[PDB]
Amino acid sequence: NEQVRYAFHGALQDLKSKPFATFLTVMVIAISLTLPSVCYMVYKNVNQAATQYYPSPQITVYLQKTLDDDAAAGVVAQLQAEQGVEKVNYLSREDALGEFRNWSGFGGNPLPAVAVVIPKLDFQGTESLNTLRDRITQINGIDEVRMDDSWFARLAALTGLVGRVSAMIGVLMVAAVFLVIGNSVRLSIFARRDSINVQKLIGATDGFILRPFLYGGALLGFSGALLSLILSEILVLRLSSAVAEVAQVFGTKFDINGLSFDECLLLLLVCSMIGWVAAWLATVQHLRHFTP
Amino acid sequence: NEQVRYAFHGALQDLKSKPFATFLTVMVIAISLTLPSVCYMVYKNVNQAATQYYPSPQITVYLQKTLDDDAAAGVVAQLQAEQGVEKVNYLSREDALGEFRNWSGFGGANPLPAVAVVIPKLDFQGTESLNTLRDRITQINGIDEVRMDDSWFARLAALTGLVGRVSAMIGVLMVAAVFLVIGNSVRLSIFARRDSINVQKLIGATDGFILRPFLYGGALLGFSGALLSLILSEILVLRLSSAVAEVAQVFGTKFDINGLSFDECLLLLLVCSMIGWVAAWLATVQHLRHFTP
Amino acid sequence: MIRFEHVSKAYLGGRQALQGVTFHMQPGEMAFLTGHSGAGKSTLLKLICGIERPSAGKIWFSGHDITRLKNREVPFLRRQIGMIFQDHHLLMDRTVYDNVAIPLIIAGASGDDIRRRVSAALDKVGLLDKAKNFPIQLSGGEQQRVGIARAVVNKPAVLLADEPTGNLDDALSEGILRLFEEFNRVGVTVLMATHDINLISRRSYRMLTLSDGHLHGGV
Amino acid sequence: MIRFEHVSKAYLGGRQALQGVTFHMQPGEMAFLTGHSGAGKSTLLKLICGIERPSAGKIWFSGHDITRLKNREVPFLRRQIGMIFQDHHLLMDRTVYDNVAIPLIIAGASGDDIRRRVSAALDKVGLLDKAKNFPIQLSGGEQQRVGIARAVVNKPAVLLADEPTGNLDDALSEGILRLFEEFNRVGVTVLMATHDINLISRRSYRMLTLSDGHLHG
Numbered sequence A: 001n002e003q004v005r006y007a008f009h010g011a012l013q014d015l016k017s018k019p020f021a022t023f024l025t026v027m028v029i030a031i032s033l034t035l036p037s038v039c040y041m042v043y044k045n046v047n048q049a050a051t052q053y054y055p056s057p058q059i060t061v062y063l064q065k066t067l068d069d070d071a072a073a074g075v076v077a078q079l080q081a082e083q084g085v086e087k088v089n090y091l092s093r094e095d096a097l098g099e100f101r102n103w104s105g106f107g108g109n110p111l112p113a114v115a116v117v118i119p120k121l122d123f124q125g126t127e128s129l130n131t132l133r134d135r136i137t138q139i140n141g142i143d144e145v146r147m148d149d150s151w152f153a154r155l156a157a158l159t160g161l162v163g164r165v166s167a168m169i170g171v172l173m174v175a176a177v178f179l180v181i182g183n184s185v186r187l188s189i190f191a192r193r194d195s196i197n198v199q200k201l202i203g204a205t206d207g208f209i210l211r212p213f214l215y216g217g218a219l220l221g222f223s224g225a226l227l228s229l230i231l232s233e234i235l236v237l238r239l240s241s242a243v244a245e246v247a248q249v250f251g252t253k254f255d256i257n258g259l260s261f262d263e264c265l266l267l268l269l270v271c272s273m274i275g276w277v278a279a280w281l282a283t284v285q286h287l288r289h290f291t292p
Numbered sequence B: 001n002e003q004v005r006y007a008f009h010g011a012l013q014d015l016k017s018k019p020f021a022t023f024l025t026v027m028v029i030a031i032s033l034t035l036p037s038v039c040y041m042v043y044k045n046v047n048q049a050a051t052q053y054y055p056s057p058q059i060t061v062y063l064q065k066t067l068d069d070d071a072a073a074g075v076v077a078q079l080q081a082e083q084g085v086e087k088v089n090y091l092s093r094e095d096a097l098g099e100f101r102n103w104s105g106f107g108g109a110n111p112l113p114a115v116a117v118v119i120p121k122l123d124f125q126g127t128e129s130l131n132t133l134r135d136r137i138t139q140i141n142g143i144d145e146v147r148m149d150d151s152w153f154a155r156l157a158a159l160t161g162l163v164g165r166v167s168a169m170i171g172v173l174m175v176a177a178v179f180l181v182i183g184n185s186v187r188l189s190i191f192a193r194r195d196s197i198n199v200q201k202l203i204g205a206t207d208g209f210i211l212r213p214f215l216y217g218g219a220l221l222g223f224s225g226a227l228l229s230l231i232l233s234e235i236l237v238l239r240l241s242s243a244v245a246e247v248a249q250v251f252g253t254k255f256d257i258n259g260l261s262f263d264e265c266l267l268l269l270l271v272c273s274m275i276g277w278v279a280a281w282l283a284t285v286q287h288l289r290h291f292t293p
Numbered sequence C: 001m002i003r004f005e006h007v008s009k010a011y012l013g014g015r016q017a018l019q020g021v022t023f024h025m026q027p028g029e030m031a032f033l034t035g036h037s038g039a040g041k042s043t044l045l046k047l048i049c050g051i052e053r054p055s056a057g058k059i060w061f062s063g064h065d066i067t068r069l070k071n072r073e074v075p076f077l078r079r080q081i082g083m084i085f086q087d088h089h090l091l092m093d094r095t096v097y098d099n100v101a102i103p104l105i106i107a108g109a110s111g112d113d114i115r116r117r118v119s120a121a122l123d124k125v126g127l128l129d130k131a132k133n134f135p136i137q138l139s140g141g142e143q144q145r146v147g148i149a150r151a152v153v154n155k156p157a158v159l160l161a162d163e164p165t166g167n168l169d170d171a172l173s174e175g176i177l178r179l180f181e182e183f184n185r186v187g188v189t190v191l192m193a194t195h196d197i198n199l200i201s202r203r204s205y206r207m208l209t210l211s212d213g214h215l216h217g218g219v
Numbered sequence D: 001m002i003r004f005e006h007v008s009k010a011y012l013g014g015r016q017a018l019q020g021v022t023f024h025m026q027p028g029e030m031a032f033l034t035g036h037s038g039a040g041k042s043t044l045l046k047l048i049c050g051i052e053r054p055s056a057g058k059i060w061f062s063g064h065d066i067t068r069l070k071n072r073e074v075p076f077l078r079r080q081i082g083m084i085f086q087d088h089h090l091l092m093d094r095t096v097y098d099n100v101a102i103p104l105i106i107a108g109a110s111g112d113d114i115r116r117r118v119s120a121a122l123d124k125v126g127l128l129d130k131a132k133n134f135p136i137q138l139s140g141g142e143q144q145r146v147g148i149a150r151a152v153v154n155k156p157a158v159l160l161a162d163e164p165t166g167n168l169d170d171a172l173s174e175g176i177l178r179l180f181e182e183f184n185r186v187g188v189t190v191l192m193a194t195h196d197i198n199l200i201s202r203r204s205y206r207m208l209t210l211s212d213g214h215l216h217g
């Protein structure tokens, strides 16, 4: 680690020679890396909210008319035993008696009970709904296994379009970080025409030319990722302050999950490696034009 | 226009000097213009998608019994001339609302009053509309069921403000992103040469003459920058136009996705080429200020 | 007339290039200024075009004062000086044909005059063969020849020669000297600067020798 | 031992800069090759180090032939030639002290003997007070001097010269030529290529002249 001292030494004064351009080329590239972090913040907080808050795929299932006053407990006990629906909300015949009198007064008697069916997210497909309709109907004492759909048809269709457009935006941003690193590094290299010629005409090794440009690209990507993380964290705090007054009408305390430590290391290492390969592609495709 | 032909010739000679480098510069400046366009059509289609929505702002206009239908037409003219944003529908309580009485006579089992729904436009909304409407409401007889619904009304006011703040923040960071990326591209494009600025001034020239093929080069880079985005955004639109079909039929209607009309395309080209008129102008004079005695 | 007051120049590095230079530079005749390697024999020519400011005194040109020009007329007055360089500066990645046609564009040339002006300029140096190529494939002798060729155009009022024939042989040294020597029938002042004496000793014009920025000898 | 036979050069436009030359070159002996302005001497001068391929023919160097070889072999043997140029290929961004320290850090010497080697390679040139500064405020009379100061570093087996004394006085030409003369005490060749005739007339060494890239004048 003694011959690599000079390669790390030269890039520091190379960047510090013109400080405003060095600041500008990191400020332009952190705000290009702000948006994958912002989209990742937007993605991962609505996903944990999607576990409990909005989706509740209940299917209104009616029991037999006057089979028994406590026949729903047997349905709960038998539906606990199979896959798919595990937890069943206990709604007996006396539950429907107390649950249907208020609706009549709000709008203006056998009364079979209404069961609660939750297929979670592994059997939420409409093609997989009919598989769950087979086991409920084949159990005796159940008359109406009536569909609801409507809102559930919209819930099972718009999520595909939102996932597809988010995947398209994510692919376009991973192409953007794949390309703006290479653009910035290759303009930094093509700003220097004399140096490669001087260290190549003088007897050397190709790795000696390769090392300082590669280290400069690596530290440029490192600085861009660090400034991107610092600029994203204050926006996460600003949005936490923006959602603090919105979450108090939802009835529960809500907070935004920030940039975790296990992914920031991955972001820094992929920015270092993309600076590595950007400087490799910028320098190898530049010193092949100096060998006649 | 005889003196400016050398500027166009030098600009096209610079662009044709390194076709791969200039193509990569056009690609990096064009991939930045994709997201203002994408966010603009996303913000645009939700305006016509705000014509219909599931949480409709229902107003409890439950009038009296039997004789309320005769007085319903008398009172609808006074309230519509009060604020001007008032849409009231009326149905026959004895005949047309018998299905609503038969709703309780279903599998999920004339005392109920008449049902009327008032949905105003989004231009006249907020607490001020409620303050100007509840002062003269229930002005006939006694009116039962004075209990309004405002749980969805409060949340839609809160949710649209949140995504409005998010969209405003996203838009200002996009204009910051495009401004700094055209500044970075033009500044490194003119910093890639050093002798071409020095030799033009060591031989006696005009200060405006060296500004011509750099301002025109930046303007043509900005003008060619937006065109590749305007032949790439609609490609992604038609790639994602297929998924609109199966989610439109579940809405009970047919919805068409809007595109980039020619009124805003010229605006986007003008705002993306005008920043080449500024970035090159500042960067060249900053570079030649360091070479003056 | 071109007149010097008691002027000098140093830099930020603490090196005093000039320590007092004064001469009256008459229009029309030649000059063969020379000195040692550390002498200010090039920075004397750099002050004529006004691309550096003198640290001391005041500087005069033609019939005007070229001191304190706020970057709006020293673009204008520099155009009549074909100031040659020591090391060659050419517009790289750009052909020779419009490389020597650079000062004609600013001066407002027509379409027809550029061709015959470039042709007549390159006749005097004799390079109508490597005319449409780039200066990458030009060797150093013709690089110096096209560097001195672009001073000839626009018919400048004052000519400066900051070391020509440093990359030329003795056979073409007399020709590139006589290209300057034919300018005596027109009203142009030529400041030839060199190191060697052998072609200078074969001629007889003004000697302006300097030692660390002091002329002493040489009126 | 540098051996030549018929070697030519036609880069892109078919301009026959060279067509063939044949001379042996003993180790330790000096030379003063020259020509006219359009004569192909600098191309021949670069054929010894061989940064371009010599097209037809082949060039023998010491005990090896380097005609069309890989890029993992040519820059290893490029360290033994004293590359100076007519144009000033110098690092404009970096200062003078590490312009001449490039062969030292390629050779991988320790950091303590860099300073005495550089000062030993600059005192005979005569530039210590004008060191540790940038070449942009150095004039050509010392820019050409610091250009060759990296060639005398680390004692190369063969030393190359591409027109020195281009911006130097005749007294400084004699001083720099006596700087070049003391290298002939050890086994390194001198390959001066100057247009000056009075400097080479004051001494007798191996004088050859190429006339328009063919044969021997």
Ligand SMILES: Nc1ncnc2c1ncn2[C@@H]1O[C@H](COP(=O)(O)OP(=O)(O)OP(O)(O)=S)[C@@H](O)[C@H]1O
Residues within 6 Å of the ligand: C011, C012, C013, C015, C016, C017, C036, C037, C038, C039, C040, C041, C042, C043, C044, C086, C163, D130, D136, D137, D138, D139, D140, D141, D142, D167, D168
């Ligand atoms: N821009 C500059 N800044 C600082 N010092 C300078 C500058 N230009 C020249 N010098 C110094 O001034 C002295 C000689 O100046 P110059 O006239 O440029 O040299 P010269 O006339 O070119 O002599 P040459 O190169 O042998 S023809 C040297 O000590 C230089 O280091």
Ligand SMILES: Nc1ncnc2c1ncn2[C@@H]1O[C@H](COP(=O)(O)OP(=O)(O)OP(O)(O)=S)[C@@H](O)[C@H]1O
Residues within 6 Å of the ligand: C136, C137, C138, C139, C140, C141, C142, C167, D011, D012, D015, D017, D035, D036, D037, D038, D039, D040, D041, D042, D043, D044, D086, D163
């Ligand atoms: N890369 C190149 N491509 C084409 N022609 C070239 C190239 N390099 C040199 N030449 C030609 O080589 C011829 C002379 O070669 P040189 O030996 O370089 O001449 P010279 O006498 O050395 O001039 P200088 O100033 O001393 S380099 C000229 O006709 C040049 O056009």
